[PDB]
Design a protein around this motif. Structure first.
Motif, PDB file in Angstrom:
ATOM      1  N   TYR A  14       1.782   0.968  14.167  1.00 39.21           N
ATOM      2  CA  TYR A  14       1.993   0.730  12.743  1.00 39.21           C
ATOM      3  C   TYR A  14       1.378   1.869  11.946  1.00 39.21           C
ATOM      4  N   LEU A  15       2.208   2.544  11.147  1.00 38.61           N
ATOM      5  CA  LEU A  15       1.768   3.632  10.270  1.00 38.61           C
ATOM      6  C   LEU A  15       1.073   4.739  11.059  1.00 38.61           C
ATOM      7  N   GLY A  16       1.554   4.986  12.276  1.00 44.17           N
ATOM      8  CA  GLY A  16       0.970   5.988  13.141  1.00 44.17           C
ATOM      9  C   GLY A  16      -0.287   5.562  13.868  1.00 44.17           C
ATOM     10  N   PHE A  17      -0.722   4.315  13.709  1.00 46.01           N
ATOM     11  CA  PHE A  17      -1.936   3.818  14.342  1.00 46.01           C
ATOM     12  C   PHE A  17      -1.597   2.907  15.514  1.00 46.01           C
ATOM     13  N   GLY A  18      -2.416   2.985  16.562  1.00 45.68           N
ATOM     14  CA  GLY A  18      -2.419   1.999  17.617  1.00 45.68           C
ATOM     15  C   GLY A  18      -3.613   1.072  17.462  1.00 45.68           C
ATOM     16  N   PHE A  19      -3.562  -0.064  18.153  1.00 45.72           N
ATOM     17  CA  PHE A  19      -4.584  -1.091  18.022  1.00 45.72           C
ATOM     18  C   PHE A  19      -5.140  -1.452  19.392  1.00 45.72           C
ATOM     19  N   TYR A  48       0.787  -1.224   0.000  1.00 50.41           N
ATOM     20  CA  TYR A  48       0.000   0.000   0.000  1.00 50.41           C
ATOM     21  C   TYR A  48       0.823   1.280   0.000  1.00 50.41           C
ATOM     22  N   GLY A  49       2.147   1.195   0.099  1.00 50.41           N
ATOM     23  CA  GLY A  49       2.961   2.391   0.209  1.00 50.41           C
ATOM     24  C   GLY A  49       3.275   3.068  -1.109  1.00 50.41           C
ATOM     25  N   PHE A  50       2.917   4.350  -1.217  1.00 47.20           N
ATOM     26  CA  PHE A  50       3.274   5.188  -2.365  1.00 47.20           C
ATOM     27  C   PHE A  50       2.805   4.574  -3.683  1.00 47.20           C
ATOM     28  N   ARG A  51       1.583   4.052  -3.692  1.00 51.04           N
ATOM     29  CA  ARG A  51       1.015   3.471  -4.896  1.00 51.04           C
ATOM     30  C   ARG A  51      -0.251   4.220  -5.298  1.00 51.04           C
ATOM     31  N   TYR A  55       3.705  -1.330   3.821  1.00 53.13           N
ATOM     32  CA  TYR A  55       3.714   0.061   3.381  1.00 53.13           C
ATOM     33  C   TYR A  55       5.172   0.489   3.293  1.00 53.13           C
ATOM     34  N   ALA A  56       5.685   0.608   2.067  1.00 53.56           N
ATOM     35  CA  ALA A  56       7.099   0.901   1.807  1.00 53.56           C
ATOM     36  C   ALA A  56       7.919  -0.185   2.495  1.00 53.56           C
ATOM     37  N   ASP A  57       8.856   0.146   3.384  1.00 52.43           N
ATOM     38  CA  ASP A  57       9.657  -0.857   4.072  1.00 52.43           C
ATOM     39  C   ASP A  57       9.126  -1.173   5.467  1.00 52.43           C
ATOM     40  N   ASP A  58       7.839  -0.941   5.708  1.00 52.20           N
ATOM     41  CA  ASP A  58       7.205  -1.194   7.001  1.00 52.20           C
ATOM     42  C   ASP A  58       6.181  -2.307   6.804  1.00 52.20           C
ATOM     43  N   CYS A  59       6.527  -3.517   7.236  1.00 54.02           N
ATOM     44  CA  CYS A  59       5.713  -4.701   7.004  1.00 54.02           C
ATOM     45  C   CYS A  59       5.397  -5.391   8.324  1.00 54.02           C
ATOM     46  N   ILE A  60       4.179  -5.916   8.434  1.00 53.49           N
ATOM     47  CA  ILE A  60       3.778  -6.737   9.568  1.00 53.49           C
ATOM     48  C   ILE A  60       3.150  -8.017   9.035  1.00 53.49           C
ATOM     49  N   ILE A  61       3.474  -9.135   9.675  1.00 53.71           N
ATOM     50  CA  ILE A  61       2.947 -10.443   9.313  1.00 53.71           C
ATOM     51  C   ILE A  61       2.110 -10.947  10.480  1.00 53.71           C
ATOM     52  N   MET A  62       0.957 -11.536  10.168  1.00 54.59           N
ATOM     53  CA  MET A  62      -0.017 -11.936  11.176  1.00 54.59           C
ATOM     54  C   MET A  62      -0.275 -13.431  11.068  1.00 54.59           C
ATOM     55  N   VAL A  63      -0.043 -14.152  12.166  1.00 56.89           N
ATOM     56  CA  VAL A  63      -0.216 -15.595  12.236  1.00 56.89           C
ATOM     57  C   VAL A  63      -1.097 -15.927  13.438  1.00 56.89           C
ATOM     58  N   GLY A  64      -1.373 -17.218  13.613  1.00 53.74           N
ATOM     59  CA  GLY A  64      -2.363 -17.652  14.580  1.00 53.74           C
ATOM     60  C   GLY A  64      -1.838 -18.102  15.930  1.00 53.74           C
ATOM     61  N   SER A  65      -0.520 -18.195  16.085  1.00 55.47           N
ATOM     62  CA  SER A  65       0.050 -18.653  17.343  1.00 55.47           C
ATOM     63  C   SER A  65       1.429 -18.041  17.534  1.00 55.47           C
ATOM     64  N   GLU A  66       1.920 -18.120  18.773  1.00 57.18           N
ATOM     65  CA  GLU A  66       3.255 -17.611  19.071  1.00 57.18           C
ATOM     66  C   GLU A  66       4.333 -18.498  18.464  1.00 57.18           C
ATOM     67  N   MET A  67       4.168 -19.821  18.562  1.00 58.75           N
ATOM     68  CA  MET A  67       5.144 -20.734  17.978  1.00 58.75           C
ATOM     69  C   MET A  67       5.259 -20.526  16.474  1.00 58.75           C
ATOM     70  N   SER A  68       4.135 -20.260  15.807  1.00 57.26           N
ATOM     71  CA  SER A  68       4.190 -19.925  14.389  1.00 57.26           C
ATOM     72  C   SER A  68       4.812 -18.553  14.165  1.00 57.26           C
ATOM     73  N   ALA A  69       4.642 -17.632  15.117  1.00 62.43           N
ATOM     74  CA  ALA A  69       5.223 -16.304  14.964  1.00 62.43           C
ATOM     75  C   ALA A  69       6.739 -16.332  15.099  1.00 62.43           C
ATOM     76  N   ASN A  70       7.272 -17.207  15.955  1.00 60.08           N
ATOM     77  CA  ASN A  70       8.720 -17.268  16.134  1.00 60.08           C
ATOM     78  C   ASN A  70       9.406 -17.872  14.916  1.00 60.08           C
ATOM     79  N   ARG A  71       8.795 -18.887  14.301  1.00 60.39           N
ATOM     80  CA  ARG A  71       9.413 -19.502  13.130  1.00 60.39           C
ATOM     81  C   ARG A  71       9.328 -18.584  11.915  1.00 60.39           C
ATOM     82  N   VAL A  72       8.219 -17.854  11.766  1.00 61.61           N
ATOM     83  CA  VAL A  72       8.111 -16.894  10.672  1.00 61.61           C
ATOM     84  C   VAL A  72       9.109 -15.759  10.864  1.00 61.61           C
ATOM     85  N   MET A  73       9.253 -15.277  12.101  1.00 57.46           N
ATOM     86  CA  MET A  73      10.216 -14.215  12.381  1.00 57.46           C
ATOM     87  C   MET A  73      11.628 -14.632  11.988  1.00 57.46           C
TER      88      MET A  73
END
Ligand SMILES: [K+]
Ligand SMILES: [K+]
Lengths: 290, 292
Positions: free
Chosen positions: B272-277, B111-114, B224-242
């Motif tokens: 992320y991108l100036g937003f909180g969640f 979505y960055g600069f497009r 967005y440009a060089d600011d990326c977040i990846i979303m997974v379903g568990s912590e164990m999956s988050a550590n391996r993706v990281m």
């Protein structure tokens, strides 16, 4: 558009409508049914609901009136249809949206696919930075508290010829559907007032977009929140008088003459954004206002 | 398409005219030459024919980007490289022919600069992915793209699509001039970036390789440009993706991952991108709003 009801009630369209409403989440209606109970509810009563819709015998439940605290201390009013009615409303909107999207103005950004409030802000900024920094900020009373039902259904009938669709849409007007204005607090989320009423608002307000386009006016609009941008106060005063008179006489809507104003970008609050001039970048910019 | 003779389209009268009008419309700060945007037309009236002759013969020398420090809404400063308005004009002319080409390659969640895309769309797409159950956030933090990207590796990647040697030449020279990404979006500010309209496209070209790899692995993400977040379903999956994506970013893309700021987090801790969640228990969904 003679037989749109069977499209709305098709197996594919209702299955897509169910999945989308489950993804939307949202508070419960007057029946207290949460989104996780919709599958079991439709497995038992789905065919009965489809039969009632075919024969104009479906009775929509009234929207639940809830008060949501705003981040500025105030409160906002919201009408929440039951998850069954949000399911039906999504089914209707899935068929009506592709029909009306080709009619809509490119500077309308409220509750449309692939459009959001940030686009309206950037488009307004580009117009302001072109020299159109005299803002005609017309404030409108709540759309669904002031719109004439017969006038709205007549306008819809110019495009939609299916009487069964006209009927169920009118029955949802009286059920109390309205515009979730959570966007004014800069909150990004899924609106909770069902997916039918904002489209109905855009249908009527598209008449205002067409009139402004004919007069050559630069504008952006998000639901019933529109700003017009001109190059001088002289043209701003003339546009303020002509557009407000058109909105009330031709559209039947109500203009709040106290909140409506002719302004400059510096003192403008629009869609939760504040506007300011950046002397380093030589341009007006915007950011969320406190 | 045939990309062997793109320089002729870049230097065409209509493309240069549309480039001039867009850069004047963008306005922005001045470069090292101190020339204001209102002075571009007179400058092009005098030297425009010479400039395009130099661009046609790879004899145009871009001016270095003017390094400026911009104060932020509250706190520290912000580094920004401002090309001269002439170089912004040429960069816009290049991007006007390259952007339609690469828009056919880019991922829908970039979505960055497009064109017709903005930061709020990345937020809403991320919110929908979180509310589907992928509320474990792989928040990888990258060092500044144009401070770490290998110029040869980037031009070699661009050459896979662009076969015009004159375009490759002027784009590499602009990489050397110091173009970079105006990260004003991080402060929730809506406005026109000042770092020129070529560097964001070039960063999206390289990072499109990351988008295709994540799509291949079936990962949900927004970028967005060089600011990326990846979303997974568990912590164990988050550590391996990281660990896997960080290794891919560094070994296969030549970029640098900031291991200090990168983290596996929940939405409530994400900025992320100036937003909180935050999770709305009455609406039964995660939502976003501008953070403090
Ligand atoms: K308004
Ligand atoms: K990140």
């Amino acid at each position: 558009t003679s037989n749109l009801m069977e499209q709305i009630l098709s197996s594919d369209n209702l299955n897509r409508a169910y999945l989308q409403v489950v993804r939307n989440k949202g508070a419960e209606g007057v029946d207290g049914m949460k989104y996780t109970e919709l599958k079991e509810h439709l497995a038992k009563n789905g065919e009965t609901i489809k039969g009632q819709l075919r024969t104009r015998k479906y009775k929509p439940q009234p929207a639940r009136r809830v008060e949501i605290p705003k981040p500025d201390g105030g409160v906002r009013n919201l009408g929440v249809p039951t998850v069954t009615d949000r399911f039906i409303q999504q089914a209707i909107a899935q068929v009506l949206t592709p029909i009306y999207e080709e009619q809509f103005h490119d500077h309308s950004y409220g509750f449309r696919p692939n459009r959001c409030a940030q686009q309206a802000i950037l488009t307004a900024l580009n117009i302001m930075n072109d020299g159109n920094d005299w803002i005609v900020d017309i404030d409108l009373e709540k759309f669904f508290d002031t719109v004439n039902h017969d006038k709205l259904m007549t306008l819809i009938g110019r495009t939609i010829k299916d009487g069964d669709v006209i009927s169920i849409v009118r029955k949802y007007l009286v059920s109390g559907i309205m515009i979730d204005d959570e966007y004014e607090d800069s909150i990004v989320g899924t609106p909770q007032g069902g997916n039918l009423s904002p489209l109905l608002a855009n249908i009527m307000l598209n008449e205002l977009d067409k009139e402004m386009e004919k007069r050559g006016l630069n504008f952006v609009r998000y639901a019933d929140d529109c700003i017009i941008m001109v190059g001088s106060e002289m043209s701003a005063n003339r546009v303020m008088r002509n557009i407000s008179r058109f909105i009330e006489e031709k559209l039947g809507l109500k203009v709040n003459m106290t909140k409506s104003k002719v302004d400059r970008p510096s003192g403008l609050k629009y869609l939760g954004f504040g506007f300011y001039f950046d002397p380093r970048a030589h341009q007006f910019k915007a950011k969320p206002h406190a």
